[PDB]
Amino acid sequence: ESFLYFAYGSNLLTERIHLRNPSAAFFCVARLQDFKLDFGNSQGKTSQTWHGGIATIFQSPGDEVWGVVWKMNKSNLNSLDEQQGVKSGMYVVIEVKVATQEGKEITCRSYLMTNYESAPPSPQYKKIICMGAKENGLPLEYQEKLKAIEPNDYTGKVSEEIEDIIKKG
Template identity: 40%
Template sequence: MGTFLYFAFGSNLLKERLRIENPSAVFKGIAKLQGYKFHFSWTNQETSSEEATWKGCAANITADPSSHVWGSLWELKDEDRPSLDRQEWGYNPITVTVCDDKGATYTCLTYQMKGEPTGETLPSPQYKDIILRGAKQSMLPSEYIKFIEAFPDNKNTTPVDIYNQLVKLLT
């Protein structure tokens, strides 16, 4: 059975989140995706799985030649690809080239939200917290972590089941 590389930039930065559905995931390091911008958004599609699961808008990347996105590079077994696609059902799989912190380049899979983004909107504090925990766990650059921290959230106070499950795993 083969493997594939996956570039995570949202909640799957956190090892425990990714491994819930994809147990073969092995962290390979951090990487930078040049020519894309990280943001939180809705789309003109029906509510995505991330939006429903996390009670707010979801992380997305869109083309922007003057920007870059930091994330974590994972190696997964091919047998985990269907579960990763199911987890990311509100996103289209795309192939991108990323560069690690030593300058090596890799062709890998990532996901981009389906439909046209309808503007910048707010994530739930729980979703943003998991992304930040993953960014710190992956040891993304401190300036990039501050960039994510600066996004406001929607102040959601209703329970977020996946968040509660992950917090239990982390304690």
């Protein structure tokens, strides 16, 4: 009655994933081998939540992506899908096999964009991602990679609830 979800974008942060998925439970940190992290505008349209490119992954031998595996109730499958804009063509549901630090392979649900234009993330979206990576102890090398991502020059605001999270951090 449960499934595992591999998050690599803003759902790295516990407080963020809990906004719409309060019952999500931390499972483990894991590595997705032979994928590269990118940021982009799905269907060439900028996210009005985040005001910059949002996270995606594509297959790239030799690259890697680190994330958090969350344990969720299967009753929340449709809700998670809705949040990711699956019907609107923003993301497609994928299945990935990820490696734990104990050398175990875990099968997870995740999401990626299939039609997008690359574009840098807003400062706020980058910050939330870095906050989640730190909170859940992703490898320091990968945290440094995230910190090195060049943001766009958006100087406006995102939602109050998101801005509050950034301030508390």
